[PDB]
Symmetry: D2
Subunit: 257 residues, 4 copies
């Protein structure tokens, strides 16, 4: 009942963190529009969850996103929350192995897709005093090795969240982000499979957190439901869901030369 009667759009909701967010909002009583560029996971989720429907939509295609918003309004009559979760982490890449072209393409997905849906949704969010939740990353704040383009995109998302929070505050629309750390998702599994020792990569990922495990999509989903439903004095915050990875010292002649 915590978010009953509300309508939520989750991008990249077909698997991983996005699917966990979809489930959390359905369990809170909301109706959820699952947006994904891939049919497989999202179509099955729509069949599984009564309060959820699937709309095929690539967030990098402006006309897909326009139709996503117009269809949400046509079918459900209101829009209360947009969760900008669609995003990608490329394989580890040394800086000299990156390209400006690949950087631009990653910006299109991780940053501009979030910008585009938010812009198209804002007129409806103003009517409902709704809110925006962007899924950024801990690595936007602290950096990550072999990931210059990805880190840059997430630093942009977190900063953009604060700017938009300032601009939308007079209209009662809150804008927040969640910065997850290592969350066990199909992306994590796919990237690990490309590594020389996948099991050692997964173990290193678990041990990066003081809690000694990776996080779950359900845990990111609970943070999202909190931000939407019970955080009415929170705007422009970065909610860390990281297991403590940012805390303390870790493994990163004369001792000082």
């Amino acid at each position: 009942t915590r978010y009953a009667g509300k309508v939520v759009v989750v991008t990249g909701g077909g698997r991983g963190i996005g699917a966990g967010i979809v489930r959390a909002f359905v369990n809170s009583g909301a109706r959820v529009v699952i947006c994904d560029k891939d049919e497989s996971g999202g179509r099955a989720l729509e069949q599984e969850l009564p309060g959820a429907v699937f709309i095929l939509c690539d967030v990098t295609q402006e006309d897909d996103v326009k139709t996503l918003v117009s269809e949400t309004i046509r079918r459900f009559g209101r829009l209360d929350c947009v969760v900008n979760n669609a995003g990608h982490h490329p394989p580890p890449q040394r800086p000299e192995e990156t390209s400006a072209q690949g950087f631009r393409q990653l910006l299109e997905l991780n940053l501009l897709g979030t910008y585009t849906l938010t812009k198209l949704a804002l007129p409806y969010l103003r009517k409902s005093q709704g809110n925006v939740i962007n899924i950024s990353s801990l690595v936007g704040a602290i950096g990550q090795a072999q990931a210059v383009p990805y880190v840059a995109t997430k630093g942009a998302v977190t900063a953009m969240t604060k700017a938009l929070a300032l601009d939308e505050s007079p209209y009662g629309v809150r804008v927040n982000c969640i910065s997850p750390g290592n969350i066990w998702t199909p992306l994590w599994e796919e990237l690990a499979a490309l590594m020389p020792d996948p099991r050692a990569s997964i173990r290193e990922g678990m041990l990066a957190q003081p809690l000694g495990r990776m996080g779950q999509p359900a845990e990111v989903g609970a943070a999202a439901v909190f931000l939407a439903s019970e955080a009415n004095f929170c705007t422009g915050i970065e909610l860390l869901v990281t297991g403590g990875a940012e805390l303390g010292y870790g493994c990163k002649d004369a001792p000082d030369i």
Copy 2:
């Protein structure tokens, strides 16, 4: 039902933010021990709320706190969450008007009282895989005018939260803090009444937030219930409940000389 069967201790729970936290936990299904050095508010709250009882306890008195913990265990059989909310903001004081003695006394309340209860509670929190929630302040992070001792105490609380999170992570005990901004409480009203123009002080306090109002104890309480009940991958975080006060530029010859 979100925190049903759990036992929570809230210090300074007789009024203000603490009372809002008490109410939020009772509404989540928890049994709550209200600790306060003053009888008036906490005794009335115990009569009002079925799931809440009042224990007179000054957090600066080690034997009061020992009895608080032993009585909680004797009466309820477990301890799941400690909310260290007791604290005070002195009237605005220029740095040359402060004293080392007054600074020490404020440290006793705002920092050492939180340390003492946490230490005595930790053996029980380990048995229940419980958690600690410290009420710090936004001003520990960004500073505040005419408040050198207070700001220092809250910077200490936020830092201590991270250190304790590291130490207790192997035992499954999470340690987090909430940093509120301007929250409308009896302390805020009392300090405003001492100002030359109380109404102008209250207006300035409301306008420090992009949201254009101060926060409510209930909003801090909802953040506390989230941290206790649904933030299982969060440890060592600082959850801002500030209305956006930290965002953007505000009012703080040649233009550059």
Copy 3:
């Protein structure tokens, strides 16, 4: 003598902060290559300063930047420091008045131009154990009103600085950023002139800092010389040159509703 024998490239060095950085490095004993897309300021600076030469270069044009690096090496035989200062702040723009196209173009200048020069310069910086200094902005960290695209670009620069610092640490190349606040430059003057009350805008900009004035290009330049010449244990830092604008509370029914 503090940076004698070293070779520094400063982008956008023809006026404003960039020119202040050029002057600071020349005064430290370095030879400086002034890069700018506009001839006027940079050509005059080359005539004025013995240790400085001007190379016309638009950082958004990959071939301009390739020639900038090859000409620096051809003329001076080494490269020790790249200062990525070229950037632009658009006029204040409400979020619904921005466009994805304008956002992409601002990313090209503020983010990708910094990426491109850094990538082309890194092989030479590795040989000299040199360093990178990116000019970001305080608003990447705290947000700014009516500036969603700009804020996003600077959040990206600050994050990218940390990622690149991690990647280049094994090679002894440090990567840092400076985040200025309000600095009195021709850009500041030009934007103020577009405002309804330019003098009131300039006054508000001065009063956003506890120091009560805006900063000078020379002050950013001194921070840059420090990072290049005397900060050998600093990598991935964000050096704030803001006059305290981020500190404390400022101007951003019932008091809590």
Copy 4:
């Protein structure tokens, strides 16, 4: 010549970081008063350095500090910069092994000694438009294992720096802090010697930084000279001298349970 004609007080200047700060200021042309509770190192430094004199002073003793300030003024006629470096890190201690009494004593040194000298020095710093530099720690910001009291003291110092910066800004007195990471000092060597495997502890300390080494007192000293002499638009900043230790992920059933 960068700080010629200026008078600087450095507490705990007899060895370690403090001695490095003393040397850096003497090399900049300043006259330096070395304060230390121990005679051995500081007396030798006074003999070694023409521009430096030694005054025996325990910063926890208010009358020692009063005499430190009055003697500095009597002997040199002005006071331009106070560097609050005196401090201590206890051996690693689990939270249940700490005491409120030991916590209070560490607060007396690490926090209140800095407060007391700053308060007594401020009337003279106002006359000279001087500045305060507090030596905090990276661990105040990110936490540290087995160090609850120490971390709390440094979180307090960093926060207090921001509060005092706000209060002293109208008088032209800047207040900044340096947060070092692992710096190779006699304290580091002494603590390592208490460990089961001292060499392994030292190696782990070096590898906590992406730069792969610990820092030097001279590097902290250069940051201090920058803050005093060339950072006229910096107030309330935390200057990280950490080798990148805060960046990126490090070493801190199902993968997510």
